[PDB]
Amino acid sequence: QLHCSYESFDVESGVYSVSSFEAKPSGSVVEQAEGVECDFSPLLSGTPPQVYNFKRLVFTNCNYNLTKLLSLFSVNDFTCSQISPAAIASNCYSSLILDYFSYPLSMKSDLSVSSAGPISQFNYKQSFSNPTCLILATVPHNLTTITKPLKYSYINKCSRFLSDDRTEVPQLVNANQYSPCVSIVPSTVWEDGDYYRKQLSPLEGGGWLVASGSTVAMTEQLQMGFGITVQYGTDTNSVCPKLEFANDTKIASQLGNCVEYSLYGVSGRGVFQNCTAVGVRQQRFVYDAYQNLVGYYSDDGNYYCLRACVSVPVSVIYDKETKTHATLFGSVACEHISSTMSQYSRSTRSMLKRRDSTYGPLQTPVGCVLGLVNSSLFVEDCKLPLGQSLCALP
């Protein structure tokens, strides 16, 4: 690595830092769930709404298998943003939110998160604060509890006329919210181009509310649209996939190495110990000034202090005249150093093993080393100094 980094077949004698040991983190534990199913049964019946009449489902504290839900439809469009279509199923969240509506496959043209169409102007907007997986699908003929609207319809106008009856100002739909014009608009648009107007009071700032809509012919099998989004929280991440914890080792108490983990969907790896809970309880996860977890106020009544994860800094002491070297691990101490290793820094350290196939680690004041004789001699000029009064005698 050194030769390559300096693009030469003879790097000059010196002491050089090299890549650190990864410290081989142990197999994962979780603190996810307990919970109830994220039952989706509202989706199983009735006529789904016009796009300005949204029906919304929100889940907390619950467990799911969305592929079973998906089996109930034939999806003719699965697209997503800020997340893979797979990952939206695999990930735990603080909430799972689904908006559903009737929507044909002719007009199915105007649904996208970036669409500038009248569907997005007046009927739906999707925030980019959350990942969102959009679905367009059709209803199978054996979903007889599903019913279909006489036409598929939407708002194509929602603006306010000025009280002087000349100037007019549009009211665009807010993200994840209903446009105000839904208060005057009929539950479905009866005829294409239907329009309605409401005079506005001085309490309302004057003017006229003016709105209109458009329709699409009904189809033999119902077409449906789904907007699905997720929220990530802190100690509220309680919507998760159903656990596969059956037939597994006891969790999360190992401790152990810096174990990889997912605690209610909070993932990472780290060292834990039972240790003095700090303010304030029932927040579960408390973090430092850099938003790194300090520790976990666990459900088992133990506060677990996070001590992160470890690595071993390491360097090479190279004497090019003899073509030999020594190495340092230092403050880690020889408790974690052995004749072979797999944490790891390099795939091999055979360069040391050139002699150190026959030698153990030595403990020093800077700390644990390899490739060195304990001569304990006194040197006038170290040549390759180790700091303090330490020395790599040639």
Partner: protein
């Protein structure tokens, strides 16, 4: 309760006025009192040396970076080059310092060293009493070194909030200092033992080992004080001197700016690393600062896009950091050169250069091993209670003007003391104290019109 702040003006320290006068005499301002005093300074000599595992700092083993950083592998080679050389520069300066510090010979230091003076400052043969006090006063976060990382490791107090341990996250390596504190103490002890001789001929190869108080007197004879006074008031001088020494115990405050400078030197080093630490959390407008997170949250095309953004921001931080460090390192090197010069002239010997050292001219000085640098103390003589007296430009025999005389390191004062029958008296230049005019107080000079026309009684010479 306090009221309003007060609007005010800056005082001007008006110096005593003296008027030049016509003809053979003039006014002389001369102290009739003085106090010992100590000037103090901290000279930083080093930057805390660091390096980083310049891969793990960016991505902690993440597989995309294992390929993406192939593109820029030479970047971190250059990062390492700069840092590594800089670290060596720091080491070079340390060795240079100690080369100058070493003396061929020295006194042993004993309890009771300094003779009449307590020297409570002395090392308890450790660091000097002052050094240990200072070191404890500083709000230092000790580097680990050993066992270091085994306190990172969960061995008891997980409440160890120190970013000193957090280096393992970033791949930081605070590098070791280049001298054992005991050897530093040994070097410092040899500096202490290099006192006396201070002057005494060349003083460089010769080693005299001569009375501590008389070495002061010797320096005070160089200051311009007669030995008669120095001997006679020896006990009082010792008292005044030791009071000035005792005042050092109140110096461990930020009211001492040099003490505050030490504090800031620590702050500077600490801050640089803390900045880098913050940057690990710096989401760059990415889906997240965590690569593992964005992997879970993204299709791999987007994972790449986000990771690219993250990498660029992370590398930019590293680059800028190194540049700053290069500057810092150089500044420290130059600062160390200055300190070395100050040891050579302002510490190893009395200095007559003025400007530097004490502001009471200068006698003895000391230097100690402040963290990351050196702290000096300079003892001097601060004159007071000045009076104006008459002085002659010189004296001649008016009966034989080829003979004239001029005071040496002092002045010809009109007699105002009851012990002196002579019209004129002599005082040492540094302090008011009348003496007889004798051969050792004067030298033969050519005549000048401003020299007194003395036709009566001269003792140096008779005529």
């Amino acid at each position: 309760v306090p009221g309003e702040m007060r609007l005010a003006s800056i005082a001007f320290n008006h110096p005593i006025q003296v008027d030049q006068l016509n003809s053979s005499y003039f006014k002389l301002s001369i102290p009739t009192n003085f106090s010992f005093g100590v000037t103090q300074e901290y000279i930083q000599t080093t930057i805390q040396k660091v390096t980083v595992d310049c891969k793990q700092y960016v991505c902690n083993g993440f597989q995309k970076c294992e390929q993406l950083l192939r593109e820029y592998g030479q970047f971190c080679s250059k990062i390492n080059q700069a840092l590594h050389g800089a670290n060596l520069r720091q080491d070079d300066s340390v060795r240079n310092l100690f080369a100058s510090v070493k003396s061929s010979q020295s006194s042993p230091i004993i309890p009771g060293f300094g003779g009449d003076f307590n020297l409570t400052l002395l090392e308890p043969v450790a660091r000097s009493a002052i050094e240990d006090l200072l070191f404890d006063k500083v709000t230092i976060a000790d580097p680990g070194y050993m066992q270091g990382y085994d306190d990172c490791m969960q061995q008891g107090p997980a409440s160890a909030r120190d970013l000193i341990c957090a280096q393992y996250v970033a791949g930081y390596k605070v590098l070791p200092p280049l001298m054992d504190v005991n050897m530093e103490a040994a070097y410092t002890s040899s500096l202490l033992g290099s006192i006396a001789g201070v002057g005494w001929t060349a003083g460089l190869s010769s080693f005299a080992a001569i009375p501590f108080a008389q070495s002061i007197f010797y320096r005070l004879n160089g200051v311009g004080i007669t030995q008669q006074v120095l001997s006679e008031n020896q006990k009082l001088i010792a008292n005044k001197f030791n009071q000035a020494l005792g005042a050092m115990q109140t110096g461990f405050t930020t009211t001492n700016e040099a003490f505050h400078k030490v504090q800031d030197a620590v702050n500077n080093n600490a801050q640089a690393l803390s900045k880098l630490a913050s940057e690990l959390s710096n989401t760059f407008g990415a889906i997240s600062a965590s690569i593992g997170d964005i992997i879970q949250r993204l299709d791999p095309p987007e994972q790449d896009a986000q990771i690219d953004r993250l990498i660029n921001g992370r590398l930019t931080t590293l680059n800028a950091f190194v540049a700053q460090q290069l500057v810092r390192s150089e500044s420290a090197a130059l600062s160390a050169q200055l300190a070395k010069d100050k040891v050579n002239e302002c510490v190893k010997a009395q200095s007559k250069r003025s400007g530097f050292c004490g502001q009471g001219t200068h006698i003895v000085s000391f230097v100690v091993n402040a963290p990351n640098g050196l702290y000096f103390m300079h003892v001097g003589y601060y004159p007071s209670n000045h009076i104006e007296v008459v002085s002659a430009y010189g004296l001649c025999d008016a009966a034989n003007p080829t003979n004239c005389i001029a005071p040496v390191n002092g002045y010809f004062i009109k007699t105002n003391n009851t012990r002196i029958v002579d019209e004129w008296s002599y005082t040492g230049s540094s302090f008011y104290a009348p003496e007889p005019i004798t051969s050792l107080n004067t030298k033969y000079v050519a005549p000048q019109v401003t020299y007194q026309n003395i036709s009566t009684n001269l003792p140096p010479p008779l005529l």
